[PDB]
Nucleic acid binder design. Sequence first.
DNA 1: CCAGGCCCTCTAGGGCCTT
Length: 224
Amino acid sequence: SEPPRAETFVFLDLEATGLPNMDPEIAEISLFAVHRSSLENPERDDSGSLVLPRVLDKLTLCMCPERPFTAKASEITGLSSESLMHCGKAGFNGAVVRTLQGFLSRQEGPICLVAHNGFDYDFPLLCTELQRLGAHLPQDTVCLDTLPALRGLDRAHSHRKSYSLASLFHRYFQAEPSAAHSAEGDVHTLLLIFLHRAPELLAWADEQARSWAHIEPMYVPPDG
DNA sequence: CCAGGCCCTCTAGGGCCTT
Ligand SMILES: [Mg+2]
Ligand SMILES: [Mg+2]
Ligand code: NA
């Protein structure tokens, strides 16, 4: 009564109109899909530095939220309702759903979604947006949040460190990342962080990834 | 107008972490 272990890890990041307190909406989603084999033995260039897996599927979609950005969100994301409208981007709609579902169906399953603080932000927000359209992901889809995962892995060998995405990248690579609060930029940063601890995080996923079906919506979406 | 599960510090209080 067990599905096989996850075969593709789909790294996820959302830019949105704000934090959960204001019922945010997705303005940009980026997904990097990586086969498990690329994670079990991370590819490195001749200098010994991590490289992006060669066989990598990618999807980035911008979309216009129904309700306004907070000023802070517009600032850090470089996005606004006007700029998204001006570039002809509709809201989170059937086309997003169909594109996303096609993209996931291109991956060898089962799929493990990966997002930083995903349990508290990206997964419930994505769940809300999909729910509003009555859309579903594959039933054997599971979810890994690198925040409690890295915290738990570190605790596993401990006899107040920051686990923000930026602090983790700084700690592991001793340098600053690029394109912060661009969805694609922050997925890239997340993937590098994951690759740095890949065997540990794979083991964690295999044991503790949560079923997508257990993810609850951040908020109940209004009707139109 | 203003989240919440988590974690660690004087077990209730406070900050983290996501935009
Ligand atoms: Mg994020
Ligand atoms: Mg981001
Ligand atoms: Na981007």
